[PDB]
Design goal:
cell wall biogenesis/degradation; ATP binding; binds the ligand O=C(O)CC[C@@H](NS(=O)(=O)c1ccc(COc2ccc(/C=C3\SC(=O)NC3=O)cc2)cc1)C(=O)O; alpha/beta; identical protein binding; Rossmann fold; Mur_ligase_C_dom_sf; six-stranded parallel sheet; six-stranded mixed sheet; globular; Protein-Tyrosine Phosphatase, Chain A; cell division
Length: 435
């Protein structure tokens, strides 16, 4: 594509919006920027000669544009944006701009849970093979900051939102890892509309990788599959140990992995299937599986002291993700579970199954605290903030217990993002968790 002379409007700042600004400027196009927030992050790092409008959308600017670049954080359904679309004004996102320029194969990963782990993993597989790889998208750097002529492979985490505005992706290997309820505040046509957005990732992909255990990950020549008991990539359980297997051949005893748990093992399978489709050597891909330590805020033990494990799973920002943490979870004594924040209109009831017995306590906070507490009121306390919940639970903690921040919600009602929320839990854990 050629943008010269075009009237360009970027909706949304932050890192991503700033990368879009720099993208256009470096191509000799001065965009204008709008953001519905009065002081969006990065405002102060915006260059002085870029026109900006904050606090709302400017329909004069939008209806004047030749191209609208919408941040994933604004709904295409927003009245101002659908007015523009009705006018035949072209609307894209950062990812779409990336895909038009990228000069290396792209491995594209989406999913309600696991997508950051799989993306990171595939990145580490490439790195183990000596491949110059750019890893990012919806994590790490925004995609436009990855763009580099010497890159030999890109591995992009993509959200449903990014996919809605992307049309030029032709992934060398693409996956939806799973589809469980999330973002319903952005999908008024419910689960199928959310699913429909993620399905876009498969269009023109050279290989598709689907989850044989989640029918919703399949499109409406076949896809490669991964699964627990079925799928081209699957698990084989022999006698307390577990193997990764490709079409009946053993490829890795999971005792060599530093990650644990069925769902991490199916993440490994997904990563391997993607790495294989991308043409990465198998040996170095397996080697990456054994060195990978996991991501911060992803079921991350921040403190083990005095018989108590404090676990930061702050990246659990949906129900499926918390359920992943709770399902099969071994706790010696009492589980003290922190739930709360912005539940994005999710049904929390699927969590109820995991909260029976004498060994669970709930500490529910933020915007949907009352709804979370209502899962089992008898064993629940509700506060306003996570710090209050931590100071409430800490005196109760006994040798053998677990403290688990796995909130099933976004942090955005009270925090900058789930990282700040994990960081704050980590600091509090260390204060509250020794004498
Ligand atoms: O961190 C959390 O606790 C939750 C993350 C959570 N992720 S996520 O909503 O999928 C998400 C998507 C893109 C980004 C980064 O990029 C953005 C730029 C601008 C905006 C807000 C804008 S733009 C505008 O014009 N008016 C706005 O209020 C939001 C995001 C951050 C989060 C979620 O999964 O619930």
């Amino acid at each position: 594509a050629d943008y010269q002379g075009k009237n360009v409007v970027i909706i949304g700042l932050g890192l991503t919006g700033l990368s879009c600004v720099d993208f256009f400027l470096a191509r000799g196009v001065t965009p204008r920027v709008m953001d519905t927030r009065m002081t969006p992050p990065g405002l102060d790092k915006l260059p002085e000669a870029v026109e900006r409008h904050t606090g709302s959308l400017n329909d004069e600017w939008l209806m004047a544009a030749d191209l609208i670049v919408a941040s994933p954080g604004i709904a295409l359904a927003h009245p101002s944006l659908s007015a523009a679309a009705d006018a035949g004004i072209e609307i894209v996102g950062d990812i779409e701009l990336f895909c038009r320029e990228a000069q290396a194969p792209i491995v594209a990963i989406t999913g309600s849970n696991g997508k950051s782990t799989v993306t990171t993993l595939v990145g580490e597989m490439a790195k183990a093979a000596g491949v110059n790889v750019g890893v990012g998208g919806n994590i790490g750097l925004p995609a436009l900051m990855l763009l580099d002529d010497e890159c030999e492979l890109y591995v992009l985490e993509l959200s449903s939102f990014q996919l809605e505005t992307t049309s030029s992706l032709q992934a060398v290997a693409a996956t939806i890892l799973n589809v469980t309820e999330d973002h319903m505040d952005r999908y008024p046509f419910g689960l199928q509309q959310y699913r429909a957005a993620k399905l876009r990732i498969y269009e023109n992909a050279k290989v598709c990788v689907v989850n044989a255990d989640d029918a919703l990950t399949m499109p409406i020549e076949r896809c490669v599959s991964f699964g627990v008991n079925m799928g081209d990539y699957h698990l084989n359980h022999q006698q307390g140990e577990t193997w990764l297997r490709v079409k009946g051949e053993k490829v890795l005893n999971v005792k060599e992995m530093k990650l644990s748990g069925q769902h991490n093992y199916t993440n490994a399978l997904a990563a391997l299937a993607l790495a294989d489709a991308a043409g990465l050597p198998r040996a170095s891909s397996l080697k990456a599986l054994t060195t990978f330590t996991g991501l911060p805020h992803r079921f991350e033990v921040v403190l083990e002291h005095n018989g108590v494990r404090w676990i930061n799973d702050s990246k659990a920002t949906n129900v499926g993700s918390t359920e992943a943490a709770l399902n099969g979870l071994h706790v010696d004594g009492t589980l003290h579970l922190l739930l709360g924040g912005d539940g994005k209109s999710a049904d929390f009831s699927p969590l109820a199954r995991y909260l029976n017995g004498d060994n669970v306590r709930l500490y529910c906070f933020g915007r949907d605290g009352a709804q979370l507490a209502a899962l089992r009121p008898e064993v629940a306390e509700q506060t306003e903030t996570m710090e209050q919940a931590m100071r409430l639970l800490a005196p109760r903690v006994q040798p053998g217990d677990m403290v688990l921040l796995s909130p099933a919600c976004a942090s955005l009602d009270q925090f900058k993002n789930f990282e700040q929320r994990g960081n704050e839990f980590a600091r509090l854990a260390k204060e509250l968790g020794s004498h």
